């Protein structure tokens, strides 16, 4: 029993974290087989970042201009390419610590673990949700660029996120590992508006199920609701609209706890229209939306990996 | 910028996690050099746990009765000892993946990362506080026993906690790595009362400083307070009494933000006596007490390890 925001174990990803230095700037890189992946703004200074021409800036660099360190080893760069917003540095040596891995572009609403790194050195690990507006609310200091978010299913590391910047608004934006930004953002130091954000309704429902499994039951009522009726309430409170695909994803949680999805919706509408009345759910006084239905099932059943 | 509940990277600890099976029961063990550490109730069944005589039960076992698996390797037990509530299993092979490490007994109020494991296999990692009443509010399913909490400073893994049981009340209790329980608990399946718990006041203050560093400032006031006056409020709201040792530990945070500790106290008393008024601090509507002043400084400055 008990419910926690849990990160994936970060072992397999720590062995891939390296330090990339091009002249001034140093940030983190990801060393898989014999390629190092890092944000291309490693070739920028801080004034370059106002309006950079990455094409021109990278023509000014050669293989030997990229200093890449993996702990103690200084690594040997023998080929450099630009794919969208990431730099691919070809290296002399394959990483003996390369896990089985995939590159994945995730969906808004899905979660992942971030390994925050500085100078190629892991600092700590935390769980994140990709907001509906393609930002993440992370913890990233100067030099954290190149840090990666990832999922693990048994033996495979699915890399989904690389950190590139912090918006003036304080939230964070980055790319997949092919270098395509999530959201409308660009790697330029200018004002960039994130969309209006909303709450991930299917995730709040999963968390309510997790709460029932763990004994917090006060929010359950015998009222019920329709899907279309619940969605009028969702729209009023800036919740993502619930679809039948979401109901179906909540199927196993429904079946374990014996509470139909539309009964949990009627519980949720009541929470939205009346608050918690100084009570808490799983020791929180807000509605939590960073647990997918898969996260709840893995934690409430004990799925492990390697 | 940004502030998250961050766990330590779990790489160095994953390589020590093994699976220990004695007849019926299987749980996790910790393999350092050539000794495996696990809870001694691995030699119990579920009825043994009502009132076990560990002395007698362990006399019934031999070296070859302990099946210990490290991933694929089946490990060779050649000596078994009982130290308080932990079993020490001597093994044929030293762990090539043994990190630099210490055994530490921590203080109530300190925090640590837990690597939740099942069958010797890591499931995920989260950050914990040792409550003033020596429980922890974790996420532990059946078979999670033997999981360990730990800290890391640069290259050293300081093991402080091993999980042994879940109380009927839903909270968790365990030992240091010498096998001495934290708190008044025993490894027996009986009703066991945890003390009255309280809130870790020095930690709530550290988190308020973290909030100021990150731009949340609405709770600051120009009122102030004395230490003795603040402590009357603390006692009314079941907060741990603030001492001068606590004020001194908050020194660096005080100096970074320019807010004296007693000014933050007057902010806190106001929060305690008036609530948040539907506002949030670092995206939370409760006062957070799982960040030590060291945790805040490490995250707000970027301390790394290996």
Author numbering:
A (entry chain A), B (entry chain A): 1 to 306
Which text from the study accompanies this structure?
SARS-CoV-2 Mpro is a cysteine protease that forms a dimer composed of two protomers. Each protomer comprises the chymotrypsin and 3C-like peptidase domains I and II (residues 10–99 and 100–182, respectively), with the active site consisting of a Cys145-His41 catalytic dyad located in the cleft between the two antiparallel-β-barrel domains. Mpro cleaves the polyproteins at 11 positions with a consensus cleavage sequence Leu Gln | (Ser, Ala, Gly) to release nsp’s, which are required to assemble the viral replication-transcription complex. In addition to the indispensable role in viral replication, SARS-CoV-2 Mpro also plays an essential role in escaping antiviral defense by cleaving host cell proteins.
Crystal structures of 11 Mpro mutants provided structural insight into their altered functionality. We employed crystallographic structural analysis together with a high fidelity FRET activity assay by our group to assess the functional and structural changes in Mpro mutants. The crystal structures of several variants revealed the changes in side chains orientations of residues in the active site comprising substrate binding pockets, especially S2 and S4, which might lead to altered amino acids preferences. Accordingly, changes in KM values for most of variants were observed, indicating alterations in a mode of substrate binding. We observe the highest level of conformational plasticity around the S2′ and S3′ binding pockets with N142 and S46 being the most flexible residues within the structures we solved. Also, we observed that the charge distribution in the active site changes quite dramatically even upon a single substitution especially around the S3′ and S2 binding pockets. This might explain why with most mutants we see the changes in binding affinities and not the kcat values.
